[PDB]
Amino acid sequence: SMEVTVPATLNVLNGSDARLPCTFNSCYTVNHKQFSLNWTYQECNNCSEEMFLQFRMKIINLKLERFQDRVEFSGNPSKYDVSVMLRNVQPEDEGIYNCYIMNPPDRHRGHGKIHLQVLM
Template identity: 50%
Template sequence: REAESATRRGVWLSGSERTIITGCSSMDVIMPNSINALNGTTIKIPCTFTSCYKIDPNMFVMNWTYQETLNDTEEMIMAYHKKRGMVPLRSDRFGERVMFAGNLDKNDLSITLSNVQIEDEGIYNCNVRNPPDRITGQHGIQLNVVTEPLSFSPLHFIAIGASVGGALALLILSMLVVKCLRRHRKKELISEEKMEEEEKLDAEVVAEEGNKHTD
């Protein structure tokens, strides 16, 4: 009853006090289905998880495994140790190229793989268990390694040239239109000034003739 009552209040008592995260449904591992890496570079392989309970270092279980295909045996490349935290496991394939890059306080279990090789292609599995959650979270991500950045075919350059040429032509046309409008406006201003001068001269002539008649 005490445990049941505590659970309802948001606290689980199991030897030590465990805090339940409110609004949580179950264990869930979050990561994309695939990721691309350029040969020879360093890639971050992301993995985060949600759980109804905060991590208890004495009960938390986590490991990363690698397999070339779904039909191949999984090779463990990193595991959680309650005293040492996340520990990379050295292997012939990866050596010391796998490093922990996450933050356990934020449920981030991401790793980095440096000097990526073509042979590193495959599935990287993020396996998590966070008691008293009974569900073990697991998700795999496919790493694809490319040997060079995205290249452009002649058709790409033609399309880019056409786009740039079209934009340049539109810019020139816009400049010509603006220039024509300015010239037209200038002519209108000159015409208005001439009309004002003519009206002024007419007024002066009329005034002079009026003065003559008066004299």
């Protein structure tokens, strides 16, 4: 698969800002008209994926009810960075975080899995 550098497990104290890093490596130059980004969240291994962040020629956020307005971005496609923020993380936010990356002309699709753990 694509070179996607993903931390295995992320633990962040409850009630604090959590930086969730997702990054990749590929040939070519980043094209805004072509970049496709999946941002999925799951409450468990078998839980259904939920889309919260998106990139269709720009940054598009779906404003999920379970996340309210706590989801933010700190990446720019040029530096191969697509990391996302969760301000004021909650115990409900514990689960599985995933970032699929699709950067044409590269036909391979990235896949980076993070299991977020929230401490007391």
